[PDB]
Structures are given as structure tokens and as C-alpha cells.
């Protein structure tokens, strides 16, 4: 039950290590993917998107889950590095065409039936 099989990491410390050089690679990547892909993104506003995506899954505490996010980010890194990904997919993280979505209950009531 509680006992389970790991993917790579044994404890939160080593998975915490893997996300470390994943962020390493993303940092060293962002500028030259901006240069290579002719991005309209800027360098700083490239890095902070990586930071916000890394902070998005802050709640995760199961190790195996952390290995899963790290290997999926690894696949993301390969897709970006050797130009298999395309500029549109890179922009996909930045929500340009997506209109701003209200947050307060009052605006939700004004717009339509939705929780």
C-alpha cells in the first residue's frame, strides 16, 4: 500500500536535485531559443515564465510524481533544443489570444452561470 516503486529519485532531496538542473537547462536555454526561434518574447519575460511554470506545480509532494514532471520537462527540453518544436508551440505557454478571465465572484455573476 504505502510502499511503492520509484522512477529514479529515492527521496524529496534527489528529485529536488533533478528539478535544479532542469531549471539550469531552462535558464541557459531561454536566451538562445529567443535568438534562434525569432521569439517576440524578451529574455527576462522568458525566464519568469519558466519560474512561474516551475512554481505552478508547487503542491506536489509524492516523489514518483516529481520524477514524472522532471522527465516530461526533459522531453520538453529536447523538443525545444533541436528545433523540433515550432515558434507557435513556444508561444503557446504565453496566453496572448486568450482574453483575460475575471476572478471575483461579482464579475462571474455578471458574465454567466459558472463557478
Amino acid at each position: 500500500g504505502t510502499s511503492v516503486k520509484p522512477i529514479f529519485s529515492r527521496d524529496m532531496n534527489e528529485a529536488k536535485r533533478r528539478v535544479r538542473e532542469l531549471y539550469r537547462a531552462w535558464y541557459r536555454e531561454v536566451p538562445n531559443t529567443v535568438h534562434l526561434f525569432q521569439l517576440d518574447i524578451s529574455v527576462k519575460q522568458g525566464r519568469d515564465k519558466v519560474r512561474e511554470m516551475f512554481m505552478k506545480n508547487a503542491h506536489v509532494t509524492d516523489p514518483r510524481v516529481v520524477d514524472l514532471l522532471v522527465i516530461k520537462g526533459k522531453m520538453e527540453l529536447e523538443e525545444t533544443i533541436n528545433v523540433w518544436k515550432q515558434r507557435t508551440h513556444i508561444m503557446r505557454f504565453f496566453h496572448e489570444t486568450e482574453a483575460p478571465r475575471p476572478t471575483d465572484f461579482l464579475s462571474k455573476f455578471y458574465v454567466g452561470h459558472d463557478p
Binding site: 516503486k5 529515492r10 506536489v60 509532494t61 514524472l68 452561470h113
Partner: protein, 129 residues
Amino acid sequence: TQDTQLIAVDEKLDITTLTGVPEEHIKTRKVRIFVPARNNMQSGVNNTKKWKMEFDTRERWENPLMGWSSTADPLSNLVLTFSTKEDAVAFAEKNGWSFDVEERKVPKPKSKSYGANFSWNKRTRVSTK
């Protein structure tokens, strides 16, 4: 007996971030599990023998063209089957959807006898067949 470097992991699964469901669909959506009541137009029974999960219905507007039933939530015509309610609730929590539980209503077995159609004094005597 199955040595694969086993580790006690007490907290429940959080595969939510793995499933790729968007944040508002994993948070706002409320799913209920239930045994679907049989269609009263039918006497068939083998449709209330499974645990199905379905999600809250959302906006259904009519498109300008033919008044179709265009909708926005993808998880509207999505129903999942399960043998026992424990499997369904485990799936619900591990995925991360706020879940609601309804107990499996079953017909009470009633004593039925054809000899009740006729009687000497009881009111149960029928008046026509």
C-alpha cells in the same frame, strides 16, 4: 518477495498535475458517482448494476446558424464506469475532482403471492383480470 526498492508513501496520489486537466476544470468541476436508475418505461434491470460518474452540466447555448447545442466544457458528455464505488471514489480523489456520493438504491424484496388476488375477507381481492 518482490524486492524493487519499496518505499512507504503515506499521502494519497496527486496525479492531478500529470493528467493535464486545466486548473479550473480540476478545481471548479464537481463530479458525482451513482448507480443509474433504470428507465421506468422499461422493466429491464441490467443498467443499474454499475457505478457511473458524471460531471455537473454547464452552459448550453444555441449557435446563430441553426440553433445547435454548442457548448464549452469538454467534460460534459463524459461518464466513467466502475465496478464498485470504492474504485470510483479512489479515481475521483486521485484525479482531484470534488466528488459527491450517492448510495446504491436497490428494490426492496416484497412478498408476492397469486393467492392474494383472491380472498374470503381480505381487501386484497382483485376485481378483474
